[PDB]
Enzyme design. Structure first.
Site, short mmCIF file in Angstrom:
data_model
loop_
_atom_site.label_atom_id
_atom_site.label_comp_id
_atom_site.label_asym_id
_atom_site.label_seq_id
_atom_site.Cartn_x
_atom_site.Cartn_y
_atom_site.Cartn_z
N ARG A 104 0.77 -1.21 0.00
CA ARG A 104 0.00 0.00 0.00
C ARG A 104 0.82 1.30 0.00
NH1 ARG A 104 -2.38 1.85 -3.13
NH2 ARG A 104 -3.35 -0.19 -3.37
N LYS A 139 3.54 25.11 -5.16
CA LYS A 139 2.23 24.65 -4.75
C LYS A 139 2.33 23.13 -4.67
CE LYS A 139 0.00 28.34 -7.18
NZ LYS A 139 -1.39 28.83 -7.36
N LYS A 171 6.35 40.53 -5.35
CA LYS A 171 4.93 40.34 -5.56
C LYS A 171 4.24 41.64 -5.25
CE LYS A 171 2.78 37.03 -3.38
NZ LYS A 171 2.56 36.46 -2.02
N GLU A 200 6.46 39.48 -10.38
CA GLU A 200 5.12 39.13 -10.77
C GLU A 200 4.26 40.34 -11.15
OE1 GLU A 200 1.96 37.30 -8.02
OE2 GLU A 200 3.30 35.58 -8.47
N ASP A 221 0.91 37.16 -14.50
CA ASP A 221 -0.17 36.60 -13.73
C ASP A 221 -1.59 36.78 -14.29
OD1 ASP A 221 -1.39 35.39 -11.43
OD2 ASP A 221 -1.90 37.48 -10.91
O1 LIG Z 1 7.29 30.48 -6.49
C1 LIG Z 1 7.38 30.08 -7.72
O2 LIG Z 1 8.45 29.55 -8.23
C2 LIG Z 1 6.12 30.24 -8.62
C3 LIG Z 1 6.38 30.50 -10.00
C4 LIG Z 1 5.38 30.68 -10.95
C5 LIG Z 1 4.01 30.60 -10.54
N1 LIG Z 1 3.68 30.34 -9.15
C6 LIG Z 1 2.17 30.24 -8.75
O3 LIG Z 1 1.60 29.27 -9.81
C7 LIG Z 1 0.39 29.90 -10.27
C8 LIG Z 1 -0.08 29.39 -11.68
O4 LIG Z 1 -0.39 27.98 -11.83
P1 LIG Z 1 -1.81 27.31 -11.24
O5 LIG Z 1 -2.03 26.07 -12.17
O6 LIG Z 1 -1.52 26.98 -9.76
O7 LIG Z 1 -2.93 28.36 -11.34
C9 LIG Z 1 0.73 31.46 -10.22
O8 LIG Z 1 -0.37 32.47 -10.46
C10 LIG Z 1 1.24 31.57 -8.79
O9 LIG Z 1 0.16 31.85 -7.79
C11 LIG Z 1 4.77 30.17 -8.22
#
Ligand SMILES: O=C(O)c1ccc[n+]([C@@H]2O[C@H](COP(=O)([O-])O)[C@@H](O)[C@H]2O)c1
Ligand SMILES: O=C(O)c1ccc[n+]([C@@H]2O[C@H](COP(=O)([O-])O)[C@@H](O)[C@H]2O)c1
EC number: 2.4.2.19
Lengths: 284, 284
Positions: A104, A139, A171, A200, A221
């Protein structure tokens, strides 16, 4: 290839997994039905097609349960193999009781990792013929980052940030505290000159504002394809050295559309949050 | 409400998460742009609709980063709330630097646990009007089982096995070693008379074979709807006390159909492996 760092993360993960399973006692039922001297040949076989990943993690789980030499690998597939349905990824001979206890946790791990690699290979296919590379995010699931990052790499993607101190990422919050996007940028430029700058932006106006500051990477973004195209036209003329990464409104269906605008990377959170397991079973 | 067992798992999870993020250094950019005396009111808001789960885990992450009294919760929603898109799940007042450090780990966890409670509530709606209950499996991610189990329960599901020693589950492998399904069943009956028996059958023939032995729960592994109906007809007439649980070829589209056969439970592995994140952001 698991780096010593990954290999450590793996062991910690496999240990946490076995501990969740054994916390309530041993497998009373294998104990009751199968003798300690029993030995079998079992196979991890895919119930579906995909890209396999985490096979070494399977082996590490057996080391933990049977001891390094407690089993024999008669055959195995390499991580990163595109695999059809009834494929046997790895065939081993091991003490039956050990296999049944490791099952498992081992299937949970590799099913998860293969799921990520499979998904990332799809994205990597989607933008083929474009210059865009598929990249991951932070994430990730707590405790699995190193493994998930390993799986996207295995599927052909490229790892982005490993944590908070990796690179300087300005950010919205930072721009505010600094006063402006250029403010935050300059501040950071002086605080950590050795660190890669990534900023960003969520509009075309912010893009114009930072472009001349020439950060290493700009994250678009939630831009529409049309704004992304504009962004690229602008960068190409004003700051050729700045890399552009789409982040946000990405789906596998639109991936090629975004890719054709000329962006350098696609940031895909879904590769690590939202993963669909690659169905695998242990056949004895 | 997190049980003390879940609360520890939460802490362990939040700790592993933070360590992955801070392993490479502190957020050099907040440090550079935001003052230590700074304080904000931030809100956790959903970018989509779902069922919220894991809010206490968010607070726990703050305790760890800002100290128990390093923040003030102005408002919060209850775990298990059906929530629309721009909904503010929780509004707090805290030190800006702390929020920015906690952010990713906090969102990754509640996003995951909410993703699960969301999917499980959909399954639960699907079989509404039936007596079936939605149950989870051991197909959990390593290190997160207690939390994942918590979230399904929050979505309206009921927890099944927490680990290997939970109950006696006779599978194919055990049947083999014993000789037959009845053999194994008997074996375990003698080995652990105190433990709950659960036998997995993959044929109506095995069903007929074990029904008279009267186990506590029979798992119908990959049965068509028609064979599940039959299985219910036989149990109802021959061993009324035996519970039945469908496992295997379940999809949210077929859920109600399986449920209408009268089975007592639906075992859904997808609730915990294969989870899609509930998108949530920290708005300051
Ligand atoms: O910290 C990083 O390396 C990082 C680099 C690029 C994007 N992100 C996060 O990934 C998000 C986009 O992909 P998704 O599928 O989670 O919507 C973007 O809007 C952020 O909130 C994070
Ligand atoms: O050990 C348990 O608590 C447990 C209870 C019910 C089902 N399972 C496993 O969950 C499987 C079905 O869900 P899925 O989505 O993984 O196909 C089932 O056929 C088993 O192999 C596991």
């Amino acid at each position: 290839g698991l780096s010593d760092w990954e290999l450590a993360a793996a062991r910690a993960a496999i240990a946490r997994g076995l501990d969740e399973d054994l916390r309530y006692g041993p497998d009373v039922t294998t104990l009751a039905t199968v003798p300690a001297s029993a030995t079998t040949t079992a196979s991890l076989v895919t119930r579906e097609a995909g890209v396999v990943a985490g096979l070494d993690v399977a082996l590490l789980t057996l080391n933990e349960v049977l001891g390094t030499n407690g089993y024999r690998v008669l055959d195995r597939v390499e991580d990163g193999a595109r695999v059809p349905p009834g494929e046997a990824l790895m065939t081993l001979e091991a003490q039956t009781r050990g296999l049944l206890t490791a099952e498992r946790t081992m299937l949970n791990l590799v099913g998860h990792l293969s799921g990520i690699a499979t998904a990332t290979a799809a994205w990597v296919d989607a933008v083929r013929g474009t210059k865009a590379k598929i990249r991951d995010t932070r994430k990730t699931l707590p405790g699995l980052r190193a493994l998930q990052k390993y799986a996207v790499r295995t599927g052909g993607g490229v790892n982005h940030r490993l944590g908070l101190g990796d690179a300087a990422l300005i950010k919205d919050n930072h721009v505010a505290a600094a006063g402006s996007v250029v403010d935050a940028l300059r501040a950071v430029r002086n605080a950590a000159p050795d660190l890669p700058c990534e900023v960003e932006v969520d509009s075309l106006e912010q893009l114009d504002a930072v472009l001349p500051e020439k950060p290493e990477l700009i994250l678009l973004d939630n831009f529409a394809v049309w704004q992304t195209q504009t962004a690229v036209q602008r960068r190409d003329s004003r700051a050729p050295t700045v890399m552009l990464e789409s982040s946000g409104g990405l789906s596998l269906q639109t991936a090629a559309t975004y890719a054709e605008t000329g962006v350098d990377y696609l940031a895909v959170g879904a590769l690590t949050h939202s993963v669909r397991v690659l169905d695998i079973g242990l056949d004895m």
